[PDB]
Design a protein around this nucleic acid. Structure first.
Lengths: 105, 472, 50
RNA sequence: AGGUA
């Protein structure tokens, strides 16, 4: 279903890195330990990478297939398919520029 | 050093080795110069009226019982009575000084700065006054730089000539005519941009009116400020750099208990700076003693947050530590094992909460660890994806959808149509009973009666047999 | 909390036959692949329906 | 970890 004649590899630009990212990871938090709902805005986040379970906002607001083309604006969490969590990338805004080890050693 | 090194620990030790340790009186001398700097900045804020007006506004709010007393002031250099007396005499000094504006004025300013010398305020309020005076500096320099940009880029004259001619009143038309007097071409060119420059001068005069002091005194007072925080920051940085060894020594005790040593010393340096900002020698204690508790708190916070893979609250971490200590005590006393009954007895905590806490206290393990003690397979190679619908269930769902569509096709037009939107069958949306009734231009019991008729028709053992298999 | 019981929702009675009133298979009962040995049930959470 | 080819 996908057609492409070739693959390009190149240097990723900060602008296009932000283009890939759906949200900025600002906290090292992961989950609420007892409640395994991911934190905001941690490495695991429904507000950034998408909902954990199929087609429902992770706030208890919208739980249906009807709410799939519209994201939840009543809270940070958006509502889409869960497979989206396998594809959405994030970005971290480094305070100081950092050298790439591959281009170094 | 330059020894083909790639460890930040090594050259961090190199950096800390440059600064020599201090003595007990050395800390007092450095804190004394810090106190001199902070007194200088307090005097600079003293000569600024508007920050004092803001402080008096918050004092009045506190008197109206709208703000906390301990959020404005902390201690004094010789309680609500002392605060009230000092703020009353301070308001008197402020008004008697302001009256001299709108010899004698210098004496009033000196007495005003003296009556602030008694005040010792909360770091937050002091930081607010510092930021207000800093934005005063920013606005003054912004007006000056706007005049710079206009006169230079619009009249094509070098930056060197401006400093001599403009400085001295800076808020009058004297320099306009003075520069024009030499019949310079840029003087003639200035006549086409004179309106904007004069409007900016008007804004500068408005800023002066807001401050209530002439702009020259504003520059004098803010330069005194700037040198004040420069001295204060230099002395504080000297203290922090000289006290890194304490942080390193304290953190290396916590390194054997997990977590990177470098993160520990960085957090300890943060706590050390916090202690330096809060340190005083009027207490009479040693700086090391005060900084020790701050560093321990920072280290504990770091272990609580950045060492646990999953977040655990600091109070929960302390509860875990207490549970572990009491467990060790009971283990060494009874000599066999920590029994949950005694653990429940020692705490106010029931016991189910104890076991759930014990479960929480353990950290997650990597999948990259080998399952079976160094088998060439990893743990994550066995973890089944539980978020994926089984193809058996997907085929069952497809067959059920086909059967429901066929059955709905087996019914009448309006009944099947109502059923499609009532439950969201074969469209990506679902509609309520009243929503379907509105489109069917019948909003009454009739729509629900149609739904019930469809249900009753489906009750027959000719359309339910096909759906009977799906639900057992 | 999970519990062990003989009564399992939506299962055949053959499975219930080999268990006691405690939900545990009798010692010595002959079992094959797919037979139920322990009647564990888990408190079902929120359910999404197509 | 051990064992098989």
């Amino acid at each position: 279903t996908e057609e492409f004649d070739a693959i390009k590899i190149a240097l990723a630009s900060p602008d296009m890195i932000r283009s890939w990212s759906f949200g900025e990871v600002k906290k090292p938090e992961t989950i609420n330990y007892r409640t395994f709902k991911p934190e905001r805005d941690g490495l695991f986040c429904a507000r950034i990478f998408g909902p954990v379970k199929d087609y429902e906002c992770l706030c208890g607001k919208y739980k249906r297939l009807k709410h799939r083309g519209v994201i939840c604006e009543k809270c940070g969490v958006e509502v889409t398919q869960t497979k989206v969590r396998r594809e959405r990338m994030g970005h971290i805004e480094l305070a100081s520029p950092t050298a790439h080890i591959w281009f170094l050693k | 050093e330059i020894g083909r090194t790639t460890d930040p620990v090594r050259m961090y030790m190199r950096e800390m080795g440059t600064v020599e340790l201090l003595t007990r009186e050395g800390e007092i001398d450095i804190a004394k110069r810090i106190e001199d700097g902070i007194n200088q900045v307090q005097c600079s804020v003293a000569e600024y009226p508007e920050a004092i007006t803001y402080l008096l506004e918050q004092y009045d709010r506190v008197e109206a019982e709208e703000a906390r007393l301990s959020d404005l002031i902390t201690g004094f250099v010789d309680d609500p009575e002392l605060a009230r007396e000092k703020f009353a005499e301070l308001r008197a000094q402020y008004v008697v000084t302001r009256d001299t504006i709108k010899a004698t004025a210098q004496e009033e300013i000196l007495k005003l700065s003296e009556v602030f010398k008694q005040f010792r305020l909360v770091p937050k309020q002091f930081d607010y006054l510092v930021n207000s005076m800093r934005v005063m500096m920013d606005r003054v320099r912004t007006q000056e730089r706007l005049i710079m940009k206009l006169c230079v880029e619009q009249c094509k004259m070098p930056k060197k000539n401006f400093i001599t001619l403009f400085t001295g009143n800076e808020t009058s038309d004297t320099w306009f005519n003075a520069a024009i007097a030499m019949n310079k071409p840029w003087s003639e060119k200035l006549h086409d941009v004179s309106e904007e420059v004069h409007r900016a001068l008007q804004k500068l005069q408005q800023i002066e009116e807001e401050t209530g002091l002439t702009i020259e005194q504003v520059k004098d007072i803010n330069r005194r400020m700037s040198i004040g925080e420069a001295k204060a920051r230099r002395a504080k940085k000297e203290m922090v750099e000289a006290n890194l060894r304490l942080v390193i020594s304290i953190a290396k005790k916590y390194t054997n208990r997990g977590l990177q040593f470098l993160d520990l010393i960085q957090e300890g340096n943060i706590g050390l700076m916090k202690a330096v900002d809060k340190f005083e020698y009027r207490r009479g204690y040693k700086f090391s003693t005060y900084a020790t508790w701050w560093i321990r708190q920072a280290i504990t916070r770091s272990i609580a947050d950045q060492a646990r893979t999953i977040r655990i609250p600091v109070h929960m971490i302390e509860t875990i530590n207490k549970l572990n200590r009491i467990s060790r005590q009971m283990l060494q006393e009874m000599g066999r094992e920590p029994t949950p009954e005694e653990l429940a007895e020692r705490m106010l905590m029931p016991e189910d909460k104890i076991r759930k806490v014990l479960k929480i206290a353990k950290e997650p393990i990597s999948m990259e660890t080998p399952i079976g003690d160094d088998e060439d397979s990893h743990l994550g190679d066995f973890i089944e994806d539980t978020t994926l619908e089984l193809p058996l269930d997907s085929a069952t769902t497809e067959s059920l959808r086909a059967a429901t569509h066929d059955v709905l096709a087996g019914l009448t037009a309006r009944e099947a149509k109502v059923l499609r939107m009532r439950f969201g069958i074969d469209m990506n949306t679902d509609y309520t009973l009243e929503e379907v009734g509105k489109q069917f231009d019948v909003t009454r019991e009739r729509i629900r009666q149609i739904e019930a008729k469809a249900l009753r028709k489906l009750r027959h053992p000719s359309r339910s047999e096909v759906l009977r298999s799906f639900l057992d | 909390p999970e519990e062990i019981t003989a009564d399992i929702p939506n299962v055949g009675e053959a499975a219930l036959s080999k268990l006691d009133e405690s939900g545990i298979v009798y010692i010595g009962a002959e079992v094959t692949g797919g037979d139920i040995l322990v009647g564990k049930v888990t408190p079902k959470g929120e359910t999404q329906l197509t």
